[PDB]
Amino acid sequence: EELKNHVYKKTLQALIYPISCTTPHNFEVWTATTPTYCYECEGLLWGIARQGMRCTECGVKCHEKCQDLLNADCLQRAAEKSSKHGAEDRTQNIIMVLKDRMKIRERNKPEIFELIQEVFAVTKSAHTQQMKAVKQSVLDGTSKWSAKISITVVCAQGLQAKDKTGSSDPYVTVQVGKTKKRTKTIYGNLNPVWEENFHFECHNSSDRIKVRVWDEDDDIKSRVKQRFKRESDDFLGQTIIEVRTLSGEMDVWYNLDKRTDKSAVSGAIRLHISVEIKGEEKVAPYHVQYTCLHENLFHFVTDVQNNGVVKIPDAKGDDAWKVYYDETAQEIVDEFAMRYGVESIYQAMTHFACLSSKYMCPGVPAVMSTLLANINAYYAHTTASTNVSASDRFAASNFGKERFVKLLDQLHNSLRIDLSMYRNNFPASSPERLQDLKSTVDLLTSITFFRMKVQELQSPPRASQVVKDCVKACLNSTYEYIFNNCHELYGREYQTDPAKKGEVPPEEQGPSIKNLDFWSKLITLIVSIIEEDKNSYTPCLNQFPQELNVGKISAEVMWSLFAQDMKYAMEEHDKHRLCKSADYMNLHFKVKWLYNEYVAELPTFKDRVPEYPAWFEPFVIQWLDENEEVSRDFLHGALERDKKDGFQQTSEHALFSCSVVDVFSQLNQSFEIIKKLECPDPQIVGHYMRRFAKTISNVLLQYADIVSKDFASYCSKEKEKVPCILMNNTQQLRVQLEKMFEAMGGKELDAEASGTLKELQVKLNNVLDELSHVFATSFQPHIEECVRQMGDILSQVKGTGNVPASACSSVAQDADNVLQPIMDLLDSNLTLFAKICEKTVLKRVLKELWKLVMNTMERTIVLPPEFLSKLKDHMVREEAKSLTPKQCAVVELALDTIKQYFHAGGVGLKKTFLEKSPDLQSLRYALSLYTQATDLLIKTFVQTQSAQGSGVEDPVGEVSVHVELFTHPGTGEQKVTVKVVAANDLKWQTSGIFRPFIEVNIVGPQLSDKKRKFATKSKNNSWAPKYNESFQFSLSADAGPECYELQVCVKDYCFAREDRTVGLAVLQLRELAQRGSAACWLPLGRRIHMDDTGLTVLRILSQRSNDEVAKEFVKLKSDTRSAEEGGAAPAP
């Protein structure tokens, strides 16, 4: 209150006579060339020694030291000069100028005085009466030196003695003008203290105070003296003082002087002296008075006039920072800051303190950015010519540095706060609040700059980081709020059903387990925000463009927070599977899109393989599962529809049936659903491919199986189209599987998906072999039948250099006759199969058939039932009427015809495979036996009949031979010394005298020229007869001993009658080749055992029925004991 009313009064006084009424003294230096007296002090001006100043405008003559002590303006001092030259009336005139100035001022600017009244809340009547007071303080006070004076006589020291006591009873009189007063008396003292005050009136600075000290005589002498002298109280001394030496308040001691005829004087008097030319010395330092004025005015303007709205001033330039108000108010504070000097920066800091209480009002952040840029520029640069620091010049602020620092920090914090929710506090929908926002960051740069420049702080908070925190803050508050309120937000902001805009359950404003829609909704929220940040805020907040892309900070913050939440969601869905596979696939495309839009290009995530595919992968696998099972049900349907269609070929040249196509179509539709994800994690891809390669393997083996199962039922000799088509299906699987494997990225494929499909292809191959076999096999009975007929037809042909012209019928006619049962079957079927089998299929079929055929002929014709089943039977010791040249031909031509048929010009089998067919080469080889030489055949017999020695069926006795294989010392041939030691167990109890002897024979090749037989002497009546007789066979030199065997035979001697065979044993000379010599018991058989090659050779040697070696061989091997004299039957 005190300061407010003091400042009200001093503002009224300051502006009733505004200092802008005043005029300046144009002084010339002027020589007082005669003794002259100064119009201020009345002091001597004289010569050059004491020159004066003569004004022209005020005219006024004074000391130099007085030309400024001439206090009043050049109007008033022109008046006072005019009174001191002669015209006093000019003084009353300029008193009337002072009146008229104040009347005009009031009448012309009444709004100044009214505003001071309203700002200081004074009434109009009381304002009129305080205005009478400040009018009077310049209008009674228009020209006054009407001093009240208040003289405290304090004390004296060293006074003269005069007393009745012998000391003195000093009192004092004081006089000013005619008026006279006294102290009471100090008694008996020469150093008295009174401290006694006298008020006086003076009307002239050239008056004197008179002060006089008196010894108080109250005695008969003083009662007498009172009749003759005025001063009845013996005078102790005086001082006399000019009123112009006085001012304000004083406390001074003065030495004392004489006056009266009674005077004896010494010492001094102390006087306190007040002089009430003194006025408002009670100044709050005019700073503070101006502040009070300014705060009152500011609240009055903003709050009272403008209802708290900050009216931005009637301001001019950047120096709006110095024009705080409209004219009236501006002139108020300026006439105050002029009359009372208050510096422009102090005025400004006061205004910035005011504004900070309102900083949120529109445009105020631009004004405060301005005002602070200036208060900064002031302390940082204005008078930075002073070597004092900005922070210290700012300390020397009469405002108080600290008060200002606090104020900035509070404000800055309040800005940081508002920025931390920039979106909510400065919505993009208000460009005005986007501009206040922009001007706020301009203010915050201006504060950071003040801290850096005026406070001289070295690392103040960097304006970009300060704001980046606030943005991150505002973004995280946004994210929390969206993740918790997704439905309310997506609801109101976009939702594709108006019934879904409201407070949907929290399990749907955060994550649902039932649906993916919260997440599609959250995706759109995220997009929208990043857009607003990119689009409204990144431009609004461009001050740190390099540091502060609001759109990027948005995309990063929001995705990060999202991706966490989404990953957990996908894991949660995976436990429950309430949404369909498909829904997660749709969500995957949305998420894939979203990342690949906003996120992938932020450096942080450009740096990485996207992790999101790991979220969807189980749902893709679920889909692959649903898919495989559907595909396997489909597979069975397709196979069964095709089966119902009897497995027709898709066309007569599209050799597989339609199910193959359907399946590959399905598998491709399926694969493409996978492929359409393009998962950027190739191991998750690898997993899908492993999963699917299994699907494929399973489906295709299940096909190949369902085929392989039905296959044999179709192999019957009339549905033949169908097994062809099924093998073509199988092969077509392999073929399209190679394609699909390539489509899955071929050799680039996951090694285990690849492992699977390689395994699969190998199994499908092995299936196709077994089908080709099973197929070729169903014709086998027909083949065997036909081949037996061809064998029957061939048996009419014989060795036709030895037969008539119906069987010496040409090699061709015989071959044709022979061939005919098969050529019928062949031509039809191979043509049909060549038309309707895929070449892979056909080749396998044909190999199987070829083998089968070859083997069938080799058996059924070349080692035929029409030969050996006679010779080794009770039937004919066959020739097959000689398998000469002719039936070697016929067959070789038929084989060739067949080989051309199976070859089918390369449409069938390769002439290489056929020529190098073991089936053929064996067949050819058996054919070669038939034409061979007798000794080669006999060699083949002894070498193959190795078993002729190990085991005899029912022995008739045994022979002890000691045999020596001398590689002969006389010739280098092989000779065989057979020492016939004895026989034993001879089953020969004959009716005549028994006379046993032992024959020994040799068997092997090249024995036509050599003694094949020896015999011992006889022994009478003896069934274990000894001989000790030595024979010497010769072998060939060229054939080794393993080409030979002894054939021992005991016999009964009957001269003039006939000798009789008692038994037979074979000793292989292959043993004696090793043993060198051998004592051995040879069990005598009744016959000698053979194998099929003994018998094949014996069938070919029996054809040599005229060759004496082949006769004697066929005879000596068909040689047997008569059962007489010794019991049971032989065995084969």
XYZ file of C-alpha atoms in Angstrom, residues 555-1029:
475
model
C 7.769 -43.629 -36.580
C 10.631 -45.075 -34.464
C 9.021 -44.506 -31.028
C 5.624 -45.804 -32.106
C 6.884 -48.905 -34.004
C 9.169 -49.903 -31.132
C 6.360 -49.810 -28.612
C 4.061 -51.543 -31.108
C 6.369 -54.388 -32.144
C 6.788 -55.591 -28.562
C 3.048 -55.613 -28.078
C 2.322 -57.282 -31.425
C 4.901 -60.048 -30.865
C 3.259 -61.002 -27.538
C -0.140 -60.871 -29.206
C 0.802 -63.277 -31.981
C 2.282 -65.625 -29.363
C -0.999 -65.406 -27.410
C -3.198 -66.098 -30.477
C -0.988 -69.098 -31.168
C -2.092 -70.776 -27.890
C -5.831 -70.268 -28.663
C -6.248 -70.170 -32.504
C -9.686 -68.460 -32.363
C -9.107 -66.403 -35.554
C -8.688 -68.524 -38.773
C -5.216 -69.182 -40.330
C -6.342 -66.789 -43.113
C -6.927 -63.877 -40.688
C -3.302 -64.060 -39.497
C -2.193 -64.277 -43.162
C -4.204 -61.075 -43.882
C -2.691 -59.467 -40.771
C 0.740 -60.604 -41.995
C 0.233 -58.727 -45.302
C -0.880 -55.584 -43.386
C 2.100 -55.825 -41.002
C 4.481 -56.677 -43.840
C 3.180 -53.604 -45.627
C 3.396 -51.406 -42.482
C 6.995 -52.311 -41.627
C 8.022 -52.156 -45.271
C 6.406 -48.701 -45.420
C 7.309 -46.776 -42.273
C 9.844 -48.818 -40.373
C 12.232 -50.575 -42.750
C 13.832 -47.263 -43.882
C 14.588 -45.933 -40.395
C 18.363 -46.736 -40.058
C 17.667 -48.727 -36.875
C 15.552 -51.282 -38.853
C 17.186 -50.969 -42.266
C 20.095 -52.415 -40.249
C 18.055 -55.691 -39.714
C 16.320 -58.753 -41.112
C 12.716 -58.026 -39.993
C 11.742 -60.096 -36.968
C 7.944 -59.890 -37.499
C 7.817 -63.089 -39.678
C 8.633 -65.134 -36.561
C 5.264 -63.939 -35.214
C 3.186 -65.211 -38.144
C 5.184 -68.388 -38.801
C 3.080 -70.712 -36.572
C -0.103 -69.484 -38.300
C 1.524 -70.119 -41.655
C 2.469 -73.587 -40.469
C -1.138 -74.069 -39.284
C -2.204 -72.918 -42.689
C 0.296 -75.412 -44.280
C -1.293 -78.082 -42.088
C -4.886 -77.246 -43.003
C -3.581 -77.059 -46.542
C -1.848 -80.453 -46.525
C -4.852 -82.248 -45.065
C -7.209 -80.566 -47.519
C -4.636 -81.502 -50.221
C -4.607 -85.173 -49.117
C -8.400 -85.330 -49.048
C -8.348 -83.595 -52.462
C -5.700 -86.123 -53.650
C -7.961 -89.043 -52.781
C -10.935 -87.298 -54.418
C -8.896 -86.584 -57.607
C -7.492 -90.146 -57.798
C -10.998 -91.509 -57.255
C -12.577 -89.219 -59.932
C -9.836 -90.332 -62.309
C -10.429 -93.993 -61.233
C -14.120 -93.479 -61.954
C -12.959 -92.171 -65.326
C -11.144 -95.598 -65.592
C -7.831 -93.607 -65.624
C -8.089 -92.357 -69.228
C -4.996 -90.574 -70.550
C -5.476 -86.795 -70.486
C -5.169 -87.145 -74.230
C -3.758 -89.887 -76.490
C -0.477 -87.884 -76.421
C -0.838 -86.490 -72.811
C -0.085 -89.999 -71.605
C -0.866 -89.558 -67.871
C -4.402 -89.167 -66.458
C -5.958 -85.961 -65.141
C -5.412 -86.477 -61.381
C -1.694 -85.795 -61.932
C -2.571 -82.385 -63.331
C -5.157 -81.640 -60.631
C -2.624 -82.484 -57.950
C 0.107 -80.324 -59.429
C -2.462 -77.555 -59.876
C -3.450 -77.857 -56.226
C 0.157 -78.052 -55.063
C 0.980 -74.957 -57.051
C -2.098 -73.009 -55.768
C -0.866 -74.030 -52.333
C 2.801 -73.215 -52.927
C 1.875 -69.814 -54.260
C -0.101 -68.987 -51.108
C 3.201 -69.576 -49.268
C 5.284 -67.807 -51.869
C 3.022 -64.694 -51.680
C 4.313 -64.092 -48.136
C 7.976 -63.573 -49.300
C 9.137 -63.965 -45.684
C 12.382 -61.903 -45.285
C 13.642 -64.450 -42.699
C 14.970 -67.265 -44.969
C 15.168 -69.760 -42.069
C 11.472 -69.262 -41.328
C 11.080 -69.709 -45.099
C 13.275 -72.803 -44.834
C 10.865 -74.071 -42.175
C 7.846 -73.555 -44.434
C 9.790 -75.354 -47.175
C 10.736 -78.241 -44.869
C 7.074 -78.412 -43.712
C 5.845 -78.285 -47.290
C 8.457 -80.666 -48.759
C 6.974 -83.109 -46.285
C 3.457 -82.225 -47.522
C 4.636 -82.856 -51.053
C 6.451 -86.051 -50.132
C 3.435 -87.320 -48.254
C 0.866 -86.360 -50.904
C 2.999 -87.731 -53.739
C 3.970 -90.983 -52.087
C 0.315 -91.380 -51.157
C -0.526 -90.872 -54.844
C 2.262 -93.207 -56.014
C 1.101 -95.722 -53.469
C -2.627 -95.439 -54.354
C -1.450 -96.038 -57.918
C 0.979 -98.883 -57.033
C -1.851 -100.567 -55.121
C -4.337 -100.466 -57.981
C -1.580 -101.099 -60.536
C -1.560 -104.917 -60.520
C -5.394 -105.026 -60.843
C -4.919 -102.982 -64.009
C -2.007 -105.150 -65.266
C -4.449 -107.685 -66.733
C -3.816 -108.100 -70.525
C -6.805 -105.975 -71.772
C -6.843 -102.881 -69.523
C -3.169 -102.490 -70.721
C -3.778 -98.781 -71.507
C -4.391 -98.129 -67.798
C -1.038 -99.504 -66.394
C 0.743 -97.530 -69.147
C -1.166 -94.375 -68.095
C -0.490 -95.037 -64.384
C 3.254 -95.449 -65.070
C 3.011 -92.228 -67.124
C 1.259 -90.581 -64.155
C 4.097 -91.686 -61.903
C 6.714 -90.463 -64.338
C 4.683 -87.286 -64.864
C 4.752 -86.789 -61.063
C 8.552 -87.049 -61.162
C 8.656 -84.671 -64.119
C 6.391 -82.044 -62.526
C 8.041 -82.632 -59.152
C 11.361 -81.573 -60.721
C 9.471 -78.449 -61.950
C 7.864 -77.738 -58.551
C 11.226 -78.314 -56.838
C 12.636 -75.672 -59.198
C 9.567 -73.489 -58.464
C 10.411 -73.801 -54.729
C 13.817 -72.348 -55.700
C 15.470 -75.542 -56.979
C 19.130 -75.949 -55.899
C 18.776 -72.745 -53.846
C 16.193 -74.645 -51.678
C 16.634 -75.444 -47.979
C 18.901 -78.488 -47.814
C 16.334 -80.611 -45.835
C 13.315 -79.670 -47.878
C 15.713 -80.557 -50.741
C 16.775 -83.789 -48.915
C 13.066 -84.650 -48.641
C 12.275 -83.989 -52.278
C 15.424 -85.954 -53.364
C 14.377 -88.874 -51.159
C 10.897 -88.543 -52.624
C 12.149 -88.586 -56.238
C 14.324 -91.699 -55.504
C 11.300 -93.525 -54.038
C 9.106 -92.473 -56.973
C 11.826 -93.888 -59.285
C 11.939 -97.188 -57.390
C 8.100 -97.345 -57.450
C 8.258 -96.919 -61.262
C 10.707 -99.845 -61.600
C 8.385 -102.104 -59.610
C 5.358 -101.008 -61.648
C 7.296 -101.697 -64.907
C 8.164 -105.125 -63.533
C 4.659 -105.940 -62.224
C 3.352 -104.835 -65.610
C 5.809 -106.810 -67.776
C 5.132 -109.797 -65.508
C 1.366 -109.993 -66.301
C 2.335 -110.774 -69.942
C 4.830 -113.433 -68.845
C 2.283 -116.321 -69.144
C 1.365 -115.214 -72.643
C 5.062 -114.773 -73.473
C 5.930 -118.241 -72.118
C 2.963 -119.724 -73.945
C 3.893 -118.067 -77.251
C 7.587 -119.008 -76.765
C 6.611 -122.630 -76.092
C 4.611 -122.570 -79.371
C 7.604 -121.021 -81.125
C 9.674 -123.883 -79.624
C 7.054 -126.342 -80.903
C 7.221 -124.718 -84.365
C 11.068 -124.775 -84.268
C 11.075 -128.542 -83.464
C 9.740 -129.106 -87.031
C 13.002 -127.498 -88.251
C 16.032 -129.741 -87.634
C 19.644 -129.719 -88.903
C 18.411 -129.211 -92.450
C 21.592 -129.880 -94.355
C 20.437 -133.413 -93.245
C 16.576 -132.834 -93.871
C 14.064 -132.186 -96.826
C 13.074 -128.737 -98.269
C 9.963 -128.192 -96.006
C 12.372 -127.847 -93.043
C 15.311 -126.874 -95.308
C 12.610 -124.241 -95.883
C 14.540 -120.957 -95.931
C 16.084 -119.655 -92.717
C 13.565 -116.762 -93.047
C 10.394 -118.893 -93.597
C 11.289 -121.099 -90.642
C 12.084 -118.003 -88.514
C 8.720 -116.449 -89.527
C 6.770 -119.649 -88.779
C 8.616 -119.951 -85.489
C 8.253 -116.209 -84.686
C 4.626 -115.938 -85.506
C 3.033 -116.637 -82.056
C 5.083 -113.787 -80.543
C 5.190 -111.282 -83.453
C 1.405 -110.990 -83.274
C 1.534 -110.236 -79.528
C 4.596 -107.992 -79.936
C 3.636 -105.819 -82.826
C 0.232 -104.890 -81.493
C 1.383 -104.385 -77.925
C 4.704 -102.613 -78.620
C 2.916 -100.314 -81.047
C 0.134 -99.637 -78.532
C 2.731 -99.088 -75.764
C 4.942 -96.953 -78.026
C 1.850 -94.798 -78.707
C 0.700 -94.656 -75.044
C 3.808 -94.980 -72.714
C 6.211 -92.196 -71.774
C 9.731 -93.121 -72.907
C 11.073 -93.614 -69.331
C 8.042 -95.833 -68.657
C 8.330 -97.711 -71.936
C 12.068 -98.382 -71.591
C 11.578 -99.926 -68.148
C 8.594 -101.935 -69.420
C 10.613 -103.078 -72.422
C 13.724 -104.000 -70.390
C 11.572 -106.089 -68.093
C 9.820 -107.662 -71.063
C 13.128 -108.109 -72.949
C 14.790 -109.921 -70.084
C 11.638 -111.992 -69.622
C 11.490 -112.829 -73.351
C 15.213 -113.594 -73.715
C 15.193 -115.811 -70.672
C 11.974 -117.482 -71.821
C 13.481 -118.320 -75.214
C 16.759 -119.411 -73.718
C 14.908 -121.784 -71.417
C 11.901 -122.782 -73.543
C 13.794 -122.999 -76.876
C 17.616 -123.091 -76.563
C 17.794 -125.299 -73.519
C 14.331 -126.403 -74.516
C 11.754 -128.817 -73.177
C 12.057 -130.055 -76.861
C 15.542 -131.468 -76.046
C 16.779 -132.199 -72.474
C 13.392 -133.336 -71.055
C 13.791 -136.187 -73.616
C 17.530 -137.048 -73.276
C 17.549 -137.113 -69.415
C 14.203 -139.047 -69.463
C 13.014 -142.531 -70.635
C 12.374 -140.711 -73.959
C 14.931 -140.366 -76.810
C 18.721 -139.901 -76.219
C 18.040 -136.860 -78.292
C 19.653 -135.162 -81.126
C 16.610 -132.856 -81.497
C 17.446 -134.295 -84.956
C 20.705 -132.274 -84.748
C 20.751 -128.589 -83.577
C 23.111 -127.815 -86.474
C 23.812 -124.558 -88.245
C 20.152 -124.450 -89.423
C 18.378 -124.073 -86.043
C 21.376 -121.906 -84.964
C 20.279 -119.759 -87.864
C 16.422 -119.383 -87.833
C 16.831 -118.578 -84.111
C 19.641 -116.052 -84.740
C 17.411 -114.427 -87.373
C 14.345 -114.630 -85.106
C 16.451 -113.072 -82.296
C 17.496 -110.367 -84.730
C 13.872 -109.812 -85.804
C 12.863 -109.619 -82.156
C 15.867 -107.338 -81.430
C 14.711 -105.024 -84.242
C 11.211 -105.250 -82.742
C 12.356 -104.434 -79.159
C 14.647 -101.796 -80.636
C 11.756 -100.358 -82.696
C 14.283 -98.084 -84.500
C 15.429 -96.594 -81.115
C 11.820 -95.901 -79.945
C 12.236 -99.088 -77.905
C 15.519 -100.319 -76.366
C 19.085 -99.312 -77.373
C 20.883 -101.728 -79.758
C 23.772 -101.414 -77.212
C 21.669 -102.757 -74.277
C 20.258 -105.476 -76.557
C 23.662 -106.534 -78.000
C 25.203 -106.344 -74.508
C 22.152 -108.067 -73.017
C 23.400 -110.910 -70.800
C 19.992 -112.447 -71.549
C 20.981 -112.423 -75.243
C 24.685 -113.226 -74.667
C 23.805 -116.230 -72.552
C 21.273 -117.199 -75.222
C 24.045 -116.917 -77.867
C 26.387 -118.820 -75.594
C 23.982 -121.765 -75.144
C 23.567 -121.707 -78.952
C 27.373 -122.001 -79.260
C 27.458 -125.237 -77.147
C 25.329 -127.010 -79.748
C 27.915 -126.661 -82.548
C 31.073 -127.337 -80.447
C 33.824 -129.918 -80.917
C 33.648 -133.284 -79.107
C 36.779 -132.817 -76.943
C 35.754 -129.277 -75.910
C 32.357 -130.700 -74.911
C 34.044 -133.654 -73.065
C 36.396 -131.187 -71.276
C 33.364 -129.100 -70.301
C 31.805 -132.331 -68.966
C 34.785 -133.449 -66.782
C 35.342 -129.891 -65.479
C 31.605 -129.450 -64.656
C 31.083 -133.038 -63.348
C 33.486 -132.302 -60.404
C 30.880 -134.042 -58.159
C 31.693 -137.433 -59.882
C 33.742 -138.696 -56.906
C 32.206 -137.031 -53.810
C 29.289 -139.365 -52.954
C 27.990 -142.610 -54.547
C 24.334 -143.674 -54.228
C 24.236 -147.305 -52.835
C 27.862 -148.633 -53.135
C 28.390 -152.279 -54.425
C 31.880 -152.533 -52.902
C 35.012 -150.381 -52.989
C 38.475 -150.436 -54.667
C 41.742 -149.575 -52.961
C 43.874 -147.913 -55.598
C 47.224 -146.310 -55.011
C 47.532 -143.791 -57.852
C 50.624 -141.764 -58.829
C 50.319 -138.731 -61.148
C 53.819 -138.816 -62.564
C 54.318 -135.813 -64.774
C 56.171 -138.313 -66.859
C 60.015 -138.309 -66.524
C 60.505 -139.828 -70.052
C 58.328 -137.239 -71.975
C 56.928 -134.349 -69.784
C 53.349 -135.600 -70.467
C 51.134 -136.667 -67.544
C 51.057 -140.394 -66.817
C 48.980 -142.123 -64.156
C 50.504 -145.145 -62.401
C 47.370 -146.881 -61.023
C 48.492 -149.611 -58.597
C 45.295 -151.624 -58.114
C 45.842 -152.739 -54.511
C 42.584 -154.572 -53.784
C 38.807 -154.575 -53.873
C 36.547 -154.942 -50.784
C 32.815 -155.561 -49.944
C 32.160 -156.917 -53.506
C 28.384 -157.599 -53.825
C 28.916 -160.495 -56.343
C 28.010 -163.884 -54.745
C 27.846 -165.660 -58.160
C 26.682 -169.231 -59.076
C 29.836 -170.062 -61.097
C 33.293 -169.770 -59.469
C 33.840 -166.037 -58.826
C 37.103 -164.829 -60.511
C 37.280 -161.024 -59.998
C 39.734 -158.775 -61.816
C 39.752 -154.957 -61.890
C 39.427 -152.904 -65.007
C 40.559 -149.268 -64.793
C 39.542 -146.610 -67.351
C 40.596 -142.968 -67.972
C 38.089 -140.228 -69.012
C 38.788 -136.713 -70.358
C 39.457 -134.836 -73.644
C 42.028 -136.072 -76.246
C 41.764 -139.869 -75.487
C 40.985 -141.184 -79.061
C 44.685 -142.183 -79.529
C 45.460 -143.375 -75.938
C 44.826 -146.614 -74.008
C 41.542 -145.734 -72.239
C 41.446 -149.132 -70.389
C 43.587 -151.631 -68.356
C 42.754 -154.894 -66.493
C 44.391 -157.015 -63.703
C 44.888 -160.798 -63.528
C 41.908 -162.622 -61.934
C 41.707 -164.020 -58.320
C 39.688 -167.185 -57.563
C 36.740 -167.242 -55.112
C 37.519 -163.905 -53.377
C 35.186 -160.931 -52.554
C 38.025 -158.826 -51.072
C 40.618 -159.712 -53.797
C 44.140 -158.219 -53.761
C 46.098 -157.584 -56.994
C 49.054 -155.231 -56.389
C 49.138 -154.779 -60.217
